[PDB]
Design a protein around this ligand. Structure first.
Ligand SMILES: CCC1=C(C)/C(=C/C2=NC(=C\c3[nH]c(/C=C4\NC(=O)[C@H](C)[C@H]4CC)c(C)c3CCC(=O)O)/C(CCC(=O)O)=C2C)NC1=O
Ligand SMILES: CCC1=C(C)/C(=C/C2=NC(=C\c3[nH]c(/C=C4\NC(=O)[C@H](C)[C@H]4CC)c(C)c3CCC(=O)O)/C(CCC(=O)O)=C2C)NC1=O
Ligand SMILES: CCC1=C(C)/C(=C/C2=NC(=C\c3[nH]c(/C=C4\NC(=O)[C@H](C)[C@H]4CC)c(C)c3CCC(=O)O)/C(CCC(=O)O)=C2C)NC1=O
Ligand SMILES: CCC1=C(C)/C(=C/C2=NC(=C\c3[nH]c(/C=C4\NC(=O)[C@H](C)[C@H]4CC)c(C)c3CCC(=O)O)/C(CCC(=O)O)=C2C)NC1=O
Ligand SMILES: CCC1=C(C)/C(=C/C2=NC(=C\c3[nH]c(/C=C4\NC(=O)[C@H](C)[C@H]4CC)c(C)c3CCC(=O)O)/C(CCC(=O)O)=C2C)NC1=O
Ligand SMILES: CCC1=C(C)/C(=C/C2=NC(=C\c3[nH]c(/C=C4\NC(=O)[C@H](C)[C@H]4CC)c(C)c3CCC(=O)O)/C(CCC(=O)O)=C2C)NC1=O
Ligand SMILES: CCC1=C(C)/C(=C/C2=NC(=C\c3[nH]c(/C=C4\NC(=O)[C@H](C)[C@H]4CC)c(C)c3CCC(=O)O)/C(CCC(=O)O)=C2C)NC1=O
Ligand SMILES: CCC1=C(C)/C(=C/C2=NC(=C\c3[nH]c(/C=C4\NC(=O)[C@H](C)[C@H]4CC)c(C)c3CCC(=O)O)/C(CCC(=O)O)=C2C)NC1=O
Lengths: 160, 161, 146, 49, 161, 161, 160, 161, 160, 161, 160
């Protein structure tokens, strides 16, 4: 979280938290209810978000869903949307934690090696995530949509 | 380590569940006490040295412990003991901020009972040193924070006994 | 592979001859070869079989010859001389209080030559001299060693 | 310690690592250019205590 | 570690025996299969990644193992598992070149059963991952080498169970 | 403990799965070797004492171990050592019948390494005592059973080292 | 299994296995192929056995699916057949091993306490099991039907 | 346990040495002091109760130790403490007769430091109780035996600290 | 010793030694020089005692040095007399200690199990041990020969 | 480590006592033998190599130990063994100068018994190597120093057995 | 001691004691008899040295025995002289060994942290030690007074 990150840096330098570290915990916790609302809205529309990302993806890359494509077929496509459902879930976790610790251990560290084995094209997974940003972001107020957007762009960043 | 919030995230992650109403209620129960945790940490940190001195004075020194044959005899060992005390105070302050005792297990209790048995360090006397610092802390931090600080000192002390 | 095992056969088969030629060649004043418990430079200023050595000093000196030969066969199977340089690297000092170091080299010199008569020098006659050269080379100098 | 430059000075973890690395013993055996290696049984005289 | 050439030497050294006819016959039995071992290693090495991929596909993924609650859930653990798989493949290739399983004991099996018990790593599932890589390997390397590669995969798998 | 068959049943029970084709194939692979396991156990049991005697003779006695200062010096300790040997032989015979090493962990290896460190019992020497009994066993039981008996002796010995 | 039972008795006595207990194992090995086959056959028709067991049960004991009955309602009935599916599974396990062993640990030791808490009438669970015997037994040859029947009557026995 | 005569035998047995001149000299050095050890034991035994009484009076009672909050407060704990004192006196008398401290380790010191830490028993105060009994003992037994009795009291007291 | 056996009684009752216990230590230690002389004489003739014991043994029971005998051969014989040398040594220890503690821990507790394993015939061994008494006893004065004889008869007793 | 003098200082420090008559007598008993210890060390140091050679000649070589199958077979192991011998000699010389065996425990005996069990190093044979060096040492150093040098060789050898 | 600072130093290079290094092991031995004597003399007058040190201290620094002083009161003064008794004892130890060694481990390493906790003014403890030097030094011959004085000035130095 913001808490975990602050503390780990504190303990590693053998010290109490800084004024800065204390301030960010305070600003973070003040945004608690708002962050929880952002996760709720997105949890509430998860099935819709996954499908609209999936349409946006297959237009932009009809090949992935083509003879020599990693997601070619009905059940190679079913698993692909399931992976898109996984990442949206992790994005809701990140938003309520206020950093990526959880998102990272669960779904980016090791992701290159996993997908290389499965021979999944990584950069088109990054596209599927942009597609989810676009849908999710259209169900949130301007301010909340930006706050959510940072976590989408992080995942897009880590698959790189 | 984990805090209140990551405790919940990891409990749901292993089930692959999006956060539901029960989860969201737990996290609220943490956020709603958060500002008070911060204020309490600033009191403890800034009174650190005085808490150790008053805790040692009530529970350790003026005794056989500090006399020849005692484990906190010699400036070396007296220094090691109040060094330890500072660890406890400091980590309990971390646990209370995090709202989770997991750090007290990972970085303080693991192997410590046997380490103390191996050096001869008196366990019961160390617990009193912990419960005296709690007593002082609970005065300094006030109604708002007293119960919440207290529990992680109690976590520490039943971890040794 | 296949050569080396054949090459090593030959050395093993008539191991004693190679040893007796050395044993006879430095020990004058009797039959050195009777002693070996199988049968159960300057260089020489020939030790005598009963006068300077004794029976017990002689048995150590005879075993080594046989034991020295054995190591090369082990050495031959593996890629190198590692089992020979390592056990001979400081051998000079343990031996010198009661063995003439330079006398012992002549038995080693002799063995290398006498070992070769067996081979038809295709490549495997070169080999036996190569392994046994190590024992001699790495032994002398006596400053470089240990 | 304290924090001196960008920081992470005499740390807890940070201090321990400089202390190891700047030790006499470290820069002797592996000084400067070699990556550290286990000095176990074959390599050095091992203590038995 | 030891290999067939080396084992013959140390097995005789402890008896202080020259290599004799029986020894020389054993070493021949190794040398005579040597060229085939090399060719087989070059196939395995150059198909390493595909063997793991096909072995995981037949014996690990598309399952509860990769789902929440499963030990190869999370990219972290999926990565650790196929990392392990690469170790097994690579070391089995060493054992087969050496014509001796001793390296599989010294550097792979020692303590591994309990390490897996301590982390919760499913042993039976790991064995299937080993015996699936063997299946793939035996196709790729051909009649010449199939039986010889196979045994060190079987050594690995009865080492865990 | 578990055997081949209950290993499979419990692996499926935790998934709540009826036994499927893969499971049924594993169980067949056990049943099809079963008669041979029984014959092998009857040879080991009835030659128990001779196996220990020949294993001790090749790997323990006529040595510093049995001399003053050695761990199997005194009739007391010599008796304790060959008593142990009988345990190993007997349990390995159980493991091989069961076709599962789990009993060797539960009732033999757990804590044994440290027990031996605490008494001073020489570990390397004990392993040689295990691998000598294996050597004898593999002669007595014949082609049919040699590999299968052998593995549980090897399980025992990498469990100590 | 038969193996586990034989061995445990052997080890308790701390002596290698006898003749008389090194036989039963041989019988079991021959039996196991047949035993494995019976379990597979039972597994194939599981849905039919459960459903027809469930009809046979509710005719014979309509009170459990009545106002004050433990299995009254559509779910409370759904969970009841699921429990019948559980016990058929355990019966296939028992048959294959040749010894009841694992089934006991999985579904009879503690079963009185479990069902007493839930207030489930135990003897009508025993009836549901008799009902499954009747169905399963009609899909097996005379000889195999008897061999299966022993394990059904055991469960019926243990709920007592 | 071991005594001077026995220790010489077991120390040589592990080397498989006959008793030689050095051994025989050690045993003489024990036998030659033997009569004096016996007389000293008869003084200690017959003054046991008075030694404890005078040692407690100089080093334990008339103090905070015997007052509420003190570890030898309550007739229960006062009784336990002078019970302990009798153990020390009695065993030190054994050690001095045997001319070997090994019994003080085997049957008195092993685990005692931590036992006292666990109950809260003051270690430094107990040492003073030991060194006060030594003081009394050294008067009662006389020039002949004073140094020899004294050492096993000193063994006891550096065993706790 | 007498000390080890007796002090143990003191410590176990949490007390100093009795007048009785002190008296026996005194009488015991007075009998020291004599016991040391008895051990010296026997140590001084060990090779003779063993060898002549070994002849006396093989007459009274030779079969052990015959085709199917445990001690058949030169190095199977080198071990039987070595065991006789072991026990004479332990007998000298016992005599100087004035009891069997040392003799017992070193060479009787576990001796049945050791020799049963080796299938050395133990009961022949008792006779062999008895022969040593006869030889050793002929090198000692009447009084010292009896004192020695008790320890020989103990070993003979323990065996069986 | 500690010597005669620091043994006394630390024994009094834990009691917080100034040195008294008994202490002062002990220290005198050391100082009064000091010049003789120095002379003895200079003899041992300057004859180091000859002592090892005569000790090995009487107690190790010309034997099965130096033959194939023996632990001091190979120039490697022969070198390791006489290397060890030099340690023993050198440290015993330290212990004798210090008039305290504590260094022999801290830097030589700790773990050595098990280290030798783990490598197979024959303990009884090593003790004879120690007691042969003692024999030589006692001749070279003379009446003055013989008994005092001897004890630390005896300390070493009962430390292994 | 001088020895400790010495046998351990010629063991960090694996060698025997250097011929020059057995000479520091010679001056100290001669010195030790004199050194032992000085310590005994200091020990005899300990109560007088402490008490007169304590008067000299409180004149020079009356603030420590005043309202806001660490040693204010009868029992805060009693502990203060007890600490002065501790350090005189350690000074006798240092003199006798010939090397400061044990005193460091007993009473300077950790002393800053101890006294900072108790809030004791360190530099006035250093004054108490100077005061003891003055008294002790007046009970010793010129030569012995200097030899003693080095150890007093060390403690004064270490509290700094
Ligand atoms: C042998 C190594 C060693 C030393 C030196 C030592 C000192 C020591 N000094 C103490 C207190 C004290 N020490 C002093 C000393 C002084 N007050 C002043 O202002 C002066 C500067 C100074 C006298 C010269 C005082 C006043 C206290 C009481 C402080 C308190 O109770 O808060 C205490 C706590 C009381 C106790 O439990 O004994 C210790 C342990 N402990 C050790 O193990
Ligand atoms: C929460 C962390 C986490 C993730 C993300 C994860 C992904 C994951 N994706 C998989 C397969 C897959 N994933 C995809 C995904 C795609 N195909 C495409 O071309 C697109 C680029 C992309 C969809 C956007 C496909 C097509 C497969 C099937 C590949 C195969 O079966 O070979 C599998 C193997 C099937 C299984 O056993 O579940 C895993 C474990 N596992 C995890 O533990
Ligand atoms: C060089 C020889 C060598 C081996 C073989 C080795 C194995 C090994 N596997 C580990 C963990 C692991 N191993 C696995 C393996 C699997 N997960 C599954 O579900 C499957 C059944 C299986 C793959 C087929 C997993 C998931 C972990 C991570 C456990 C954790 O989260 O802590 C770890 C713990 C440290 C780490 O996480 O890297 C070690 C040391 N280490 C070694 O040094
Ligand atoms: C049922 C499973 C099981 C095992 C395996 C077991 C082993 C075991 N071995 C023991 C001791 C021992 N074990 C040995 C073994 C040996 N000595 C040697 O030198 C050889 C290297 C080795 C024989 C090959 C010896 C000598 C002792 C006695 C140690 C002592 O004197 O205390 C002890 C201590 C208690 C006792 O003495 O009986 C246990 C528990 N206990 C168990 O419950
Ligand atoms: C609450 C439980 C409890 C009790 C009762 C207790 C009694 C107790 N009585 C004591 C002495 C004593 N008690 C007495 C009592 C008596 N003399 C007589 O003749 C009468 C029979 C009797 C008065 C009715 C006397 C005379 C002494 C002094 C004995 C001495 O100093 O040798 C002492 C030693 C002095 C001290 O250090 O306090 C204790 C501890 N301690 C406890 O913890
Ligand atoms: C000090 C306590 C102690 C004793 C006594 C002891 C005896 C002992 N006797 C042995 C063998 C033996 N002992 C004998 C003795 C005899 N054969 C006979 O028929 C006669 C009855 C008897 C001679 C009187 C024989 C023949 C063997 C060889 C048996 C074999 O190798 O199978 C062995 C195995 C060989 C070895 O490794 O040393 C031991 C350990 N060990 C001990 O630690
Ligand atoms: C395989 C490599 C290898 C060798 C060769 C080796 C030799 C070796 N030679 C030895 C002694 C000896 N070796 C010899 C004699 C000789 N040695 C010779 O190579 C000459 C043929 C001859 C002198 C002309 C003698 C006389 C001794 C007795 C030691 C002494 O001088 O006291 C010893 C001491 C133990 C013993 O008495 O056997 C070793 C370890 N060790 C090794 O690991
Ligand atoms: C500073 C204190 C200190 C000591 C004493 C010490 C002993 C010691 N001896 C060792 C090996 C050894 N020690 C010996 C000793 C002997 N071989 C025999 O047959 C004789 C009975 C005996 C000589 C009298 C041998 C042969 C080895 C080599 C074992 C091997 O091949 O691995 C080793 C293993 C590492 C190495 O090989 O160097 C250590 C640490 N190490 C220390 O740090």
């Amino acid at each position: 979280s913001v808490l975990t990150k602050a503390i780990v840096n504190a303990d590693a330098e053998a010290r109490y938290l800084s004024p800065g570290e204390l301030d960010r915990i305070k600003s973070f916790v003040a945004s608690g209810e708002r962050r929880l609302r952002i996760a709720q809205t997105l949890t509430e529309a998860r099935e819709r978000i996954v499908k609209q990302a999936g349409d946006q993806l297959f237009q932009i890359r009809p090949d992935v869903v083509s003879p020599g494509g990693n997601a070619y077929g009905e059940k190679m496509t079913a698993l692909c949307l399931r992976d898109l459902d996984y990442y949206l879930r992790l994005v809701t976790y990140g938003i309520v934690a206020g950093d990526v610790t959880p998102i990272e251990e669960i779904g980016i560290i090791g992701v290159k090696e996993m997908y290389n084995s499965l021979q999944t094209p990584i950069p088109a997974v990054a596209e599927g995530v942009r597609a989810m940003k676009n849908v999710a972001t259209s169900l949130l107020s301007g301010d909340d949509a930006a706050e959510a957007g940072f976590y989408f762009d992080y995942l897009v960043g880590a698959m790189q | 380590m984990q805090d209140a919030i990551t405790a919940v995230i990891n409990n749901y992650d292993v089930q692959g569940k999006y956060l539901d109403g029960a989860a969201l209620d737990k996290l609220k129960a943490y956020f709603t006490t958060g500002a008070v945790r911060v204020r309490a940490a600033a009191v403890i940190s800034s009174n650190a040295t005085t808490i150790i001195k008053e805790a040692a004075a009530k529970a350790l020194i003026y005794s056989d412990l500090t006399r020849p044959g005692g484990n906190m005899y010699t400036t070396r060992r007296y220094a090691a003991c109040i060094r330890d005390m500072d660890y406890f105070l400091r980590y309990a302050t971390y646990a209370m901020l995090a709202g989770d005792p997991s750090i007290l297990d990972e970085r303080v209790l693991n192997g410590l009972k046997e380490t103390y048995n191996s050096l001869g360090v008196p366990i019961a006397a160390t617990v009193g040193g912990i419960q005296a610092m709690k007593e002082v802390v609970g005065g300094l931090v006030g109604p708002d924070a007293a119960k919440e600080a207290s529990i992680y000192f109690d976590y520490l002390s039943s971890g040794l006994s | 592979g296949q050569r080396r095992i054949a090459i090593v056969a030959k050395l093993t088969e008539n191991a004693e001859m190679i040893v007796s030629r050395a044993a006879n060649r430095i020990f004058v004043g009797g039959s050195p070869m009777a002693y070996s418990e199988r049968q159960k430079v300057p260089p020489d200023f020939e030790p005598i079989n009963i006068a300077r050595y004794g029976p017990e000093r002689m048995q150590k000196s005879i075993r080594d010859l046989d034991w020295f030969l054995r190591y090369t066969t082990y050495a031959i199977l593996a890629g190198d001389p590692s089992i020979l340089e390592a056990n001979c690297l400081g051998l000079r000092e343990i031996l010198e209080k009661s063995c003439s170091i330079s006398a012992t080299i002549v038995a080693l010199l002799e063995m290398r030559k006498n070992a070769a008569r067996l081979f038809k020098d295709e490549a495997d006659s070169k080999l036996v001299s190569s392994y046994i050269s190590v024992v001699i080379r790495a032994l002398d100098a006596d400053r470089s060693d240990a | 310690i304290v924090r001196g430059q960008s920081s992470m000075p005499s740390g807890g973890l940070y201090a321990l690592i400089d202390a190891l690395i700047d030790s006499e013993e470290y820069t002797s055996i592996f000084g400067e250019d070699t990556v550290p290696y286990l000095r176990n049984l074959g390599v050095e005289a091992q203590p038995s205590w």
